[PDB]
């Protein structure tokens, strides 16, 4: 259980320490680009003037994945940098970096230091305004920036912060869309506060040259997948409701979601190109709500999960996309007895259940039956409640099936100090990875898993696993233990470098990082033989339709646990889809339909169903009864859809009409 011969020698000469002399304040890390190895470390330290110690704003750069750093503070002329704006990194490998400076009180405007070459050269630029927000890059064009001023003006730059033009004077919120489209809300009188729900949603396509109003009486708006959502307020009422556009505001449509009051919120939990998970807050100070899943138009919503945990005013939620397996999401629900249970869906919210517990795990004191229970997961909520949880769940899309999380085994989330659990099949089965709380990182698309023990005392040991968490080996990475703070590694989980951050034991503490290159641990490159065939979502091996999720199967080529080798940076996850024939279970009920296995017409259109029916587009009122699940790719088999009805006359048949 640990076949890495002489790992100490393979690591000792690959351990690179960097002590950060003259650091006393907060620290921010930013990676600049992929496969560049560039890391920027920013610090800002404010000191009272009656203290002989001066302030400090340092800036360090690395280009070897954190092995060595260079103090490049001279490049920003040793200027105080606004902590709140941090480091505005450009998209992808544009190498764009923008830092905002603190300017003296009374200045005409603010100023920024810009770099378009991965922080090798910086330039000053005095702004015609004082920034209120972090500058935002256009996804389509890194040279395009926008920002809100302290006077709530919207400013746009076409030349990467060089020159700026104000394009609107009373803006509350502004976002980049596709093709350099800007969406922004505006107020008429007073402020964004006073015009709560009385905002106007505008859009510009030509970078401020022209505009179009695309919504009035606006509360707020959001972007998710191909969907533009706006919450609109009622008339002579203080409720609001979701409207949605897929043509960037040219045409809108009222969603089949309940309207909410002032103390309620909507939350776009997750959105892709096929659909959106929408959380609606429950009336009252409940701290829970209901998850709805939409069709591919963001219009018809089916109830997916009740009593979904999500605290007041949209605080903390445990809703997690398990990104290492298609269709898998975990979250927390609130029981009737005010305990919290974790639930997992494998088919994009079509069905939820409890997580299967590890074969060997015994049950908590939370478990009424000592022998039978389930696994529950610590996430954002547990962390907020000051439980001993150092990390939320982790998963990376290039590490197929792998999920790592702090949890507990019983009938509910335990307040006890949690061990760490791992799944390799995307959530179906679990095993205790390590005992006690740890920080964890995935390297080389699953090729290596790294873990640091969470302690209140300084540590000097890192743990690694080359077989996806089954077996572990410990490595002492420094002579003098450090107070651990964090793990840094290149986004994408493809590097073989990991950085251990922390401060020395002290006579004042000094920041220090130890970066380890595992290049000699996995001295062999993976070959075809090192991979096996793996059907995802397999529940019943002999079944002809085993692994069918949303219409199809996917067979992967996974690295063998036993195979100790490097996947490589350019590693491509190999998978083959098999398209399953459609059954009724690939279809969701359209508007005005429900199923008590076939979708049957509703006799009673009540609640928001009735609201939709009375105020919606006849296009959505004419249903087939059935609609195919978004993202579902089944071919052939059954097909229960048509155009049969027109439900407008149905609901209006009760009302007397003029």
């Amino acid at each position: 259980c640990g076949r890495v011969r002489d790992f100490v020698a393979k690591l000792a000469n690959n351990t690179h320490q960097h002590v950060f002399d003259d650091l006393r304040g907060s620290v921010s890390l930013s990676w600049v680009g992929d496969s560049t190895g560039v890391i920027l470390v920013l610090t800002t330290f404010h000191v009272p003037l009656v203290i002989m110690t001066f302030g400090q704003s340092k800036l360090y750069r690395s280009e070897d994945y954190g092995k060595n750093f260079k103090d490049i503070t001279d490049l920003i002329n040793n200027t105080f940098i606004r902590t709140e704006f941090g480091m505005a990194i450009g998209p992808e490998n544009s190498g764009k970096v923008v830092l905002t400076a603190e300017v003296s009180g009374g200045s005409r405007g603010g100023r920024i230091f810009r770099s378009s070459d991965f922080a090798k050269n910086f330039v000053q630029t005095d702004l015609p305004f004082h920034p209120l927000t972090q500058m935002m890059y256009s996804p389509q064009n890194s040279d395009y920036l926008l920002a809100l001023s302290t006077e709530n003006g919207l400013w746009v730059s076409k030349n990467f912060g060089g020159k700026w033009e104000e394009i609107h004077k009373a803006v509350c919120l502004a976002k980049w869309g596709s093709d350099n489209t800007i969406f922004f809300t505006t107020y008429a009188n007073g402020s964004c506060k006073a015009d709560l729900g009385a905002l106007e949603l505008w859009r510009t396509s030509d970078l401020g040259k022209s505009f179009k109003t695309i919504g009035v009486k606006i509360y707020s708006f959001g972007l998710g997948g191909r969907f533009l959502f706006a919450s609109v307020m009622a008339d002579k009422d203080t409720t609001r409701r979701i409207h949605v556009s897929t043509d960037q505001g040219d045409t809108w449509s009222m969603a089949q979601l309940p309207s909410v009051g002032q103390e309620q919120f909507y939350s776009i939990l997750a959105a892709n190109d096929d659909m959106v998970f929408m959380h609606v807050d429950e009336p009252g100070d409940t701290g829970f709500g209901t998850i709805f899943t939409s069709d591919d138009r963001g219009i018809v919503y089916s109830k997916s999960l009740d009593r979904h945990l999500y605290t007041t005013t949209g605080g903390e939620t445990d809703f997690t996309n398990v990104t290492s397996l298609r269709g898998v999401y975990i979250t927390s629900v609130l029981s009737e007895d005010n305990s919290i249970q974790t639930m997992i869906t494998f088919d994009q919210g079509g069905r939820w259940t409890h997580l299967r517990k590890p074969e060997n795990s015994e049950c908590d004191a939370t478990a009424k039956n000592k022998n039978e229970c389930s696994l529950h997961i610590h996430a954002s909520y547990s962390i907020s409640q000051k439980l001993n949880v150092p990390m939320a769940p982790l998963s990376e899309p290039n590490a197929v099936g792998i999920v790592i999380a702090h949890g507990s085994v019983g009938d509910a989330i335990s307040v006890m100090v949690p061990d760490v659990y791992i799944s390799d099949d995307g959530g179906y089965s679990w095993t205790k990875m390590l005992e006690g709380p740890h920080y964890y990182t995935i390297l080389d698309s699953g090729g290596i898993i790294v873990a640091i023990e969470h302690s209140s005392r300084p540590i000097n040991v890192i743990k690694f696993s080359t077989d996806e968490g089954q077996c572990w080996q410990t490595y002492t990475f420094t002579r003098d233990p450090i107070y651990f703070t964090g793990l840094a590694s290149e986004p994408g989980a493809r590097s073989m470098n990991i950085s251990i951050w922390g401060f020395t034991e002290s006579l004042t503490s000094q920041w220090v990082s130890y970066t380890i290159d595992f290049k000699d641990i996995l001295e062999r490159n993976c070959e075809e033989k090192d991979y096996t065939i793996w059907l995802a979502h397999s529940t019943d091996p002999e079944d002809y339709e085993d692994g069918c999720i949303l219409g199809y199967k996917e067979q992967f080529l996974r690295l063998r646990k036993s195979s100790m080798c490097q996947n490589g940076r350019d590693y491509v996850v190999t998978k083959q889809p098999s398209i399953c024939l459609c059954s009724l279970e690939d279809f969701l009920c359209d508007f005005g339909y429900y199923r008590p296995s076939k979708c049957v017409e509703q006799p009673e259109l009540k609640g928001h169903d009735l609201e939709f029916c009375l105020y919606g587009r006849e296009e959505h009122l004419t249903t087939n009864g059935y609609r195919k699940i978004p993202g579902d790719k089944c071919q052939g088999g059954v097909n229960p859809v048509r155009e049969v009805k027109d439900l407008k006359k149905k609901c209006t048949s009760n009302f007397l009409s003029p």
Partner: peptide, 6 residues
């Protein structure tokens, strides 16, 4: 540190 512009 903390410049002044006009």
């Amino acid at each position: 540190r903390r410049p002044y512009i006009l």
